Ligand binder design. Structure first.
Ligand SMILES: [Mg+2]
Ligand SMILES: [Mg+2]
Ligand SMILES: [Mg+2]
Ligand SMILES: [Mg+2]
Ligand SMILES: [Mg+2]
Ligand SMILES: [Mg+2]
Ligand SMILES: [Mg+2]
Ligand SMILES: [Mg+2]
Ligand SMILES: [Mg+2]
Ligand SMILES: [Mg+2]
Ligand SMILES: [Mg+2]
Ligand SMILES: [Mg+2]
Ligand SMILES: [Mg+2]
Ligand SMILES: [Mg+2]
Ligand SMILES: [Mg+2]
Ligand SMILES: [Mg+2]
Ligand SMILES: [Mg+2]
Ligand SMILES: [Mg+2]
Ligand SMILES: [Mg+2]
Ligand SMILES: [Mg+2]
Ligand SMILES: [Mg+2]
Ligand SMILES: [Mg+2]
Ligand SMILES: [Mg+2]
Ligand SMILES: [Mg+2]
Ligand SMILES: [Mg+2]
Ligand SMILES: [Mg+2]
Ligand SMILES: [Mg+2]
Ligand SMILES: [Mg+2]
Ligand SMILES: [Mg+2]
Ligand SMILES: [Mg+2]
Ligand SMILES: [Mg+2]
Ligand SMILES: [Mg+2]
Ligand SMILES: [Mg+2]
Ligand SMILES: [Mg+2]
Ligand SMILES: [Mg+2]
Ligand SMILES: [Mg+2]
Ligand SMILES: [Mg+2]
Ligand SMILES: [Mg+2]
Ligand SMILES: [Mg+2]
Ligand SMILES: [Mg+2]
Ligand SMILES: [Mg+2]
Ligand SMILES: [Mg+2]
Ligand SMILES: [Mg+2]
Ligand SMILES: [Mg+2]
Ligand SMILES: [Mg+2]
Lengths: 180, 262, 124
RNA sequence: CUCUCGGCCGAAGCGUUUACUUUGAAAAAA
RNA sequence: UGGUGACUCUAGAUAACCUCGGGCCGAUCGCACGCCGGCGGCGACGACCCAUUCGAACGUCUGCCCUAUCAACUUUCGAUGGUAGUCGCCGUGCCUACCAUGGUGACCACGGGUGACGGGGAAUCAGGGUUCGAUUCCGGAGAGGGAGCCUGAGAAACGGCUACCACAUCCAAGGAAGGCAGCAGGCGCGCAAAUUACCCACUCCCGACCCGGGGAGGUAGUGACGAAAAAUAACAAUACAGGACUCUUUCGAGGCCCUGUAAUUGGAAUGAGUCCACUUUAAAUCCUUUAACGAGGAUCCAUUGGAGGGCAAGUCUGGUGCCAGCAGCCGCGGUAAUUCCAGCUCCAAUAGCGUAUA
RNA sequence: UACCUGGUUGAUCCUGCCAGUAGCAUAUGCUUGUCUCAAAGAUUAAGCCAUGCAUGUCUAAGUACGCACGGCCGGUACAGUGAAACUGCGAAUGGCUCAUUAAAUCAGUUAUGGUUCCUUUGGUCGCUCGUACUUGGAUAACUGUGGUAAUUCU
């Protein structure tokens, strides 16, 4: 026996019919627009949303007055709000089922950086984050798919270590300055 | 297995000890003692985990050998010596005195006490037997056995015991209109007043108890422990007054505590 | 000149004779501070000598701003010498281990498991 | 559904007995 | 006297009993030293017996996969029950003695089989199921096979012992010694599985013990079982090539959007690596932190299967000519092969992707 | 995500299986830059096993006359560290494996009023009317004489 945790999960599920024009096109678009790495990333999101839709659907069969529906529901809606997907107007239970993929593909750090206009192309963005130029609050984030909370959005920066915001020049300007 | 088992696997440890999966295969395996192992606390959990005083088993060991820790006024140098419900831990060096009571949620919590109140404890009386030239005997839940008690003490009654002399000062009889805590069970850690007690011959006796919020619940009589006479508890109560919370209201407890924080 | 010591959780054990606490370190440009340095800053806060204080378990957060650890500060040097787990004393160089391996004393053990009384000492 | 004690209500009864149902307490942790 | 739902309970009184293979009553240890030749403080072991804790051991009720090419089964040798015992730690056909003739069975006994340790669980799933659970928790069994005991609170113990069987080591030939289904590692079997590594620092355990010990455990090594995050380029100009909005009857114009291709230019950005020092840690390692070097073409280059239909994608180009061959299935190959063998192209998933098998 | 396509006929609607399609585990082929986790001689042979290790243990408080050390002051019975050996305790846990085992094991459920229990915790421990200011013998380490090719023999 040992001191080790065995728990783990799969973060996605692969589609039932491998080849269909429809799926392929729709998922390609999703890939291109948000600058994802592979079809997996799409299925990943698609699956995380899918879970939520399951929880909701299995609350909705319960009566309103039930303690569990009230409590568990309010929690779910709350998480869903503070990530930025839902609004506080729509904060009823059913508007959950009214959710689409794009909505999570919104709140990825990769896209947020390109929306805030810190990077000038979506792909430029994915590079920029991975390149450590990007930071949240005081924290440097190395991952393109890092879902950005509603309240943590107001500070997303250029990370005072970097050339861009933090005033030390990179390797490349260093060499051209050592020649001149 | 030939004969008794000396280890405890970490995972099979009693839940309310609050241990982690990650830091070992084992857990402390309370030494044999006064409180049933499933139910109790080992000194080493309490001292290094609840209190944070010591980091490791070893630092604890160095604590008990300076003979600091006293349980019911006597030095216990065994680190896995079990302490249990209604028990007193006195640390002379810090002047800190802990009694062990159950939380609302069913865990032993750190609960601090006046050096005054620390001089006694409560016990449940498990049975009464006469022996050896007609001399009556008490057996507490602490396993302390006591002779020549007041004949008025019957079973499931609480006694107040001076920790100095180990002699009963006075007692509380078990009846409706008295004030109890559930010691183990589903409802463990709750506090209420006995409403009713129903008797099924050949089985467990069922007790109903009502709150300060008026909620009612049942347990098995063995799990009930009579703390106080009428509405007033003899022991200090823990910070949570001993009334449980629907999750929902607890969330709002937290939230209001977040909005009033700042 | 830019290094910062803050101390987060802090407690005093009368019974281990120590001020036992969590150490936070800000070091924006530099690599992680060495311990022999951090002891000095820490020391001049609590006014005690360097000797008596022991810091360990330093961990640096991703992206290189901060570092977190523990430290504990003993009343007398001697108290430390009793209470501290030995390896930490040895990083200061006070205590010294024996350099015999496990195979060593194991082998010797099973060797002298084979002889009677005074002969046991004659083996190695 | 009804009488013997105790402070009009609790213990005492039973009503044929089950199945079904709701509720309680007990259901090791992972 | 006290207690239960209920005692042949607990306590009391009477008569006696008391094991030489003996029951209790302390012939013991330490530290302080003090008091009126005497007195005593704290502890350590002991101890019969209660009670308690950890249990353990037997019972209660309900629940298991396949099989009729197993329909009757058990009872002279206990089957079922009775009465008295013996044995045991006690309840009991547990065993003996004597009686009775029972007990089980289509609600599937009895017998056989199981690539059967049972659970907690796992995989898959609309609802219902089906399959798997040797494997880290709980329970059971076993230490080459059987059997039998010493010791003890506790084993019918195997890192105790005594045999027999099977194996195998040493020998001066008389004798002696064995038990990896602990860790490593080796052989064999096989489609199928890691280092004769370092440690008691953590976790707990044992001990006369704060001090000793622990292949329990921890840490490294090997590791594409599997699971998580995630590089292989981004940008700008031009060069066009293009396209959409605007203007113009058209020619054309646009400084307005985009896109590709550029054996086009351009410096900016970084990790992979190399590598000082820190940190990490029992000592190291890794990660993280950080100096120094470190990105322009075959480099610091992505591969695995496919390209008739199912099923996403070629009426290409050269070779083969019912052969070599592919092809899960329908099928393709007999001189213009959209299916073979290849070059070009594109297509699916992507640090993964195919095959076979449950 | 409550899902189906190809295949019998000249063509059609069917019953119907074969084939496809997605997971999941074991193997395996080709390939492989980064980081976090992590299973791993179960299936067949509960087949066999060199070598090393895996269980020992002392406080102030059971026995010290080893000079082994020192050790002081030396008629102090014993100052003190202390190998060994006697004693006490532990070796019944833990670790491994899954051969056997089908109301057996096992799970929930109950019982012990039908029993045993080292230890721990508290109880008891001048309740008995009858050499003690201390009793008897032996044995181990140690000293020595030995035996046997051979041992954790004696
Ligand atoms: Mg075992
Ligand atoms: Mg009962
Ligand atoms: Mg559970
Ligand atoms: Mg009989
Ligand atoms: Mg009998
Ligand atoms: Mg007979
Ligand atoms: Mg089997
Ligand atoms: Mg099975
Ligand atoms: Mg199993
Ligand atoms: Mg294994
Ligand atoms: Mg097991
Ligand atoms: Mg066995
Ligand atoms: Mg074998
Ligand atoms: Mg023993
Ligand atoms: Mg045996
Ligand atoms: Mg062995
Ligand atoms: Mg064993
Ligand atoms: Mg092995
Ligand atoms: Mg081979
Ligand atoms: Mg393998
Ligand atoms: Mg250790
Ligand atoms: Mg040690
Ligand atoms: Mg191991
Ligand atoms: Mg490795
Ligand atoms: Mg593979
Ligand atoms: Mg992976
Ligand atoms: Mg590396
Ligand atoms: Mg390049
Ligand atoms: Mg190819
Ligand atoms: Mg081709
Ligand atoms: Mg095809
Ligand atoms: Mg097609
Ligand atoms: Mg094929
Ligand atoms: Mg084909
Ligand atoms: Mg396939
Ligand atoms: Mg036909
Ligand atoms: Mg046809
Ligand atoms: Mg099929
Ligand atoms: Mg790196
Ligand atoms: Mg095997
Ligand atoms: Mg098997
Ligand atoms: Mg011995
Ligand atoms: Mg003991
Ligand atoms: Mg005692
Ligand atoms: Mg001799």
């Amino acid at each position: 026996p040992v001191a080790r945790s065995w728990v783990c999960r799969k973060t996605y599920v692969t589609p039932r019919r491998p080849f269909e024009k429809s799926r392929l096109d729709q998922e390609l678009k999703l890939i291109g627009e948000y600058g994802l790495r592979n079809k997996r990333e799409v299925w990943r999101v698609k699956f995380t949303l899918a879970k939520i839709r399951k929880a909701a659907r299995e609350l909705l069969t319960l009566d309103e007055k039930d303690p569990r529906r009230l409590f568990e529901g309010n929690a779910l809606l709350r998480r869903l709000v503070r990530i930025g997907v839902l609004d506080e107007g729509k904060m009823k239970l059913d508007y959950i089922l009214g959710l689409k993929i794009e909505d999570f593909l919104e709140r990825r750090l990769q896209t947020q950086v390109f929306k805030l206009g810190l990077a000038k192309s979506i792909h430029h963005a994915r590079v920029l984050i991975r390149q450590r130029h990007i930071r949240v609050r005081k924290q440097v984030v190395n991952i393109p798919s890092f879902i950005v909370r509603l309240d943590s959005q107001k500070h997303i920066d250029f990370s005072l270590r970097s050339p861009y915001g933090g005033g030390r020049p990179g390797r490349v300007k260093r060499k051209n300055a050592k020649k001149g | 297995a030939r004969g008794p088992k000396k280890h405890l696997k970490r995972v099979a440890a009693p839940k309310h000890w609050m241990l982690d999966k990650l830091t070992g295969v084992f857990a402390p395996r309370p030494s044999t003692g006064p409180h049933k192992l499933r139910e109790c606390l080992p000194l080493i959990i309490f001292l290094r985990n609840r209190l944070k005083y010591a980091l490791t088993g070893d630092e604890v060991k160095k604590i008990c050998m300076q003979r600091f820790i006293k349980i019911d006024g006597k030095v216990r140098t065994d680190i896995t010596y079990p302490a249990g419900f209604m028990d007193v831990i006195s640390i002379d060096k810090t002047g800190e005195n802990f009694r062990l009571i159950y939380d609302t949620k069913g865990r032993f919590a750190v609960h601090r006490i006046t050096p005054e109140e620390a001089k006694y404890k409560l016990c449940k009386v498990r049975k009464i037997f006469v022996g050896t030239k007609g001399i009556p005997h008490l057996v507490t839940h602490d396993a302390r056995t006591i002779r020549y008690p007041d004949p008025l003490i019957k079973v499931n009654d609480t006694i107040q015991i001076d920790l100095e002399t180990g002699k009963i000062t006075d007692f509380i009889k078990f009846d409706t209109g008295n004030l109890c805590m559930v010691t183990g069970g589903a409802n463990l850690g709750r506090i209420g007043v006995i409403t009713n007690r129903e008797r099924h011959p050949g089985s467990f006796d069922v007790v109903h108890v009502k709150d300060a919020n008026g909620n009612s619940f049942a347990t098995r009589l063995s799990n009930i422990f009579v703390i106080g006479k009428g509405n007033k508890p003899w022991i200090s109560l823990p910070r949570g007054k001993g009334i449980r919370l629907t999750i929902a209201e607890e969330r709002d407890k937290r939230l209001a505590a977040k909005q009033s924080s700042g | 000149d830019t290094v910062t010591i803050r101390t987060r959780k802090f407690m005093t054990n009368r019974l281990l004779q120590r001020k036992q606490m969590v150490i936070d370190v800000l070091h924006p440009g530099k690599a992680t501070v060495p311990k022999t340095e951090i002891r000095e800053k820490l020391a001049k806060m609590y006014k005690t000598t360097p000797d008596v204080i022991f810091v360990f378990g330093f961990r640096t957060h991703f992206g290189g701003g901060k570092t977190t650890g523990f430290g504990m500060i003993y009343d007398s040097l001697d108290y430390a010498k009793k209470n501290e787990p030995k390896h930490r004393l040895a990083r200061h160089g006070l205590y010294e281990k024996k350099k015999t391996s496990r195979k060593q004393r194991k082998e010797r053990k099973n060797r002298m498991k084979k002889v009677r009384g005074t002969a046991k000492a004659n083996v190695g």
